[PDB]
Design a protein around this ligand. Structure first.
Ligand code: SF4
Ligand code: SF4
Lengths: 146, 168
C-alpha cells in the first residue's frame, strides 16, 4: 500500500476514503514509520521483498523490480547517478494495473511512488556520483552526446 | 654471352617508357604522380610499358585491346587499382571483371586508388622481374619470381602495435 503522511491521519479507514487519498485500505493493518527510519532503506527492503517474491511469469515485475532494487541499493550507498529517480518513476508508471500479468507489481510499486512523492529529498540525497555507463576504450573516440 | 644478356636486360630495365592509359580516378592519381612532390621521374608504338589504371568497361575494352596490340615487343603491363585487377567494386553488367581477362598483366597493384608510391614500388618490382628473366638476343621464358606476400610475411606478422586512430 502507498505511504501516507501525518496530514492524512485524520481520515476514516474505509475503502473509498483511503482510495481517494492515493492509497488502498488493504488489510487495514497499518504500519507506523517514525522519523529516524530512512525512507530509502525502508523502500529498499520492501522492493527486495517484492522482487524476491515475484513468481517470474511476466517481464515487468521479473526484470524491473530487481532494477529498482539495485537503484535503491545504490541510493543507500550514496552511489546513485542522475536518472535513477527518473528510472524509478518510469518503473512506477509502467508497472501499474494491466501492464503486468497480476496485481503483485502494482502493489510493489505503490510504496516506491508514494515515498518518491512525499520524501523525494532523501532519494535526491542518494545521488552523489556522475552518470557513467561505459568505460573508455583506448583507440576509439566516444560519441559525446549533449 | 652471360654478361651480354645481363647488360641487355639492364638496358631494358633502366629505360622504361610508360603509356599511362588510364580511364578513371586511378588515372587522376597518376596525373598527380607526375608532380615534383612525388618525383616519379608518348605513343603506343614506341612505348614499352602499358599501365592500365582504371575501370575496363565493356565499351572501352576494344580500345584497350587495340592499344595493347599496337605496342611492340618487349611489352609489359601493370594493372593499377581494384578495377583493373578484378573489376573491383563494380561487379556489374557493364564492367569487364579485370583487365587480365583479355590482356596479360605483369604486375598488379591493389588499391582504390593506389597512391603514387605504390606505382613506384610496382616499377621497382617490374624492373626486378625484367632483370631476372631472359629473352632471345636476336631473331620467351619469364622468371617465376617469389611472391611479395610470402617474402614480406615475416616483417608483416612481426608487427605488434600501431598508432591509435584517436590522435593524428
Ligand atoms: S506481476 Fe504477478 S504474474 Fe507478473 S511476475 Fe510478478 S508475481 Fe508473477
Ligand atoms: S580502382 Fe577505385 S580509384 Fe581506381 S578506377 Fe576503380 S573506382 Fe576509381
Amino acid at each position: 500500500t502507498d505511504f501516507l503522511t501525518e496530514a492524512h491521519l485524520d481520515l476514516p479507514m474505509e475503502f473509498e476514503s483511503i482510495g481517494k487519498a492515493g492509497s488502498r485500505l488493504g488489510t487495514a493493518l497499518a504500519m507506523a514509520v517514525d522519523h529516524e527510519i530512512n525512507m530509502v532503506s525502508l523502500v529498499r527492503n520492501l522492493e527486495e521483498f517484492f522482487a524476491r517474491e515475484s513468481c517470474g511469469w511476466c517481464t515487468p515485475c521479473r526484470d524491473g523490480l530487481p532494477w529498482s532494487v539495485k537503484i535503491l541499493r545504490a541510493l543507500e550507498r550514496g552511489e546513485g547517478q542522475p536518472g535513477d529517480i527518473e528510472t524509478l518513476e518510469q518503473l512506477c508508471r509502467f508497472l501499474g494495473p494491466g501492464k503486468t500479468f497480476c496485481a503483485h507489481a502494482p502493489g510493489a510499486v505503490e510504496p516506491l511512488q508514494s515515498a518518491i512523492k512525499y520524501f523525494r529529498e532523501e532519494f535526491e540525497a542518494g545521488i552523489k556520483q556522475p552518470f557513467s555507463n561505459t568505460h573508455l576504450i583506448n583507440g576509439i573516440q566516444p560519441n559525446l552526446l549533449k | 654471352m652471360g654478361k651480354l644478356n645481363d647488360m641487355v636486360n639492364w638496358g631494358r630495365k633502366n629505360s622504361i617508357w610508360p603509356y599511362n592509359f588510364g580511364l578513371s580516378c586511378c588515372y587522376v592519381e597518376m596525373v598527380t604522380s607526375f608532380t615534383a612532390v612525388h618525383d616519379v621521374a608518348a605513343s603506343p608504338r614506341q612505348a614499352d610499358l602499358m599501365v592500365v589504371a582504371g575501370t575496363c568497361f565493356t565499351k572501352m575494352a576494344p580500345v584497350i585491346q587495340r592499344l595493347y596490340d599496337q605496342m611492340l615487343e618487349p611489352k609489359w603491363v601493370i594493372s593499377m587499382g581494384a578495377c583493373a585487377n578484378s573489376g573491383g567494386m563494380y561487379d556489374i553488367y557493364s564492367v569487364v571483371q579485370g583487365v587480365d581477362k583479355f590482356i596479360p598483366v605483369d604486375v598488379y597493384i591493389p588499391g582504390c586508388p593506389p597512391r603514387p608510391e605504390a606505382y613506384m614500388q610496382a616499377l621497382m618490382l617490374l624492373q626486378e622481374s625484367i632483370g631476372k628473366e631472359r629473352r632471345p638476343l636476336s631473331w620467351v621464358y619469364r622468371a617465376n619470381m617469389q611472391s611479395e606476400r610470402e617474402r614480406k610475411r615475416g616483417e608483416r606478422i612481426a608487427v605488434t602495435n600501431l598508432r591509435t586512430p584517436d590522435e593524428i
